[PDB]
């Protein structure tokens, strides 16, 4: 909903910006490998928050 409100807010983006978000609690590099490499396999995600 925050992404939808930012999209309807301003600067209306000829680039189709699409965001994939998750909640964790780990300081863990295998979690980094799984999440990062599986999202790099999926459509080559360009932004990071």
């Amino acid at each position: 909903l925050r992404t939808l409100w930012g999209p309807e807010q301003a600067a209306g983006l000829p680039l189709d910006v699409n965001v994939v978000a998750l909640l964790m609690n780990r300081t863990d590099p295998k979690s980094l490998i799984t999440h990062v490499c599986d999202l790099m396999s999926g459509a080559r995600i360009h932004g990071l928050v």
Binding site: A10, A11, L13, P14, L15, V17, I33, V36, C37, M40, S41, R44, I45, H46, G47
Partner: protein, 50 residues
């Protein structure tokens, strides 16, 4: 901030250097021929806040 960096991309380029594919291969090189956001993250202003 990212979308003003991407708008400055669409100013100074019309294309985007895509992200990598896999963690398990190195195909050609790491030649950033399309010049990622470090000059494009220089100038970002939003809503009266720089």
């Amino acid at each position: 901030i990212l979308t003003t960096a991407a708008s400055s991309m669409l100013e100074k380029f019309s294309y985007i250097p895509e992200a990598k594919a896999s963690c398990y291969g190195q195909m050609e090189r790491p030649e950033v021929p399309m010049h990622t956001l470090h000059p494009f993250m220089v100038n970002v202003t939003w809503d009266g806040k720089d």
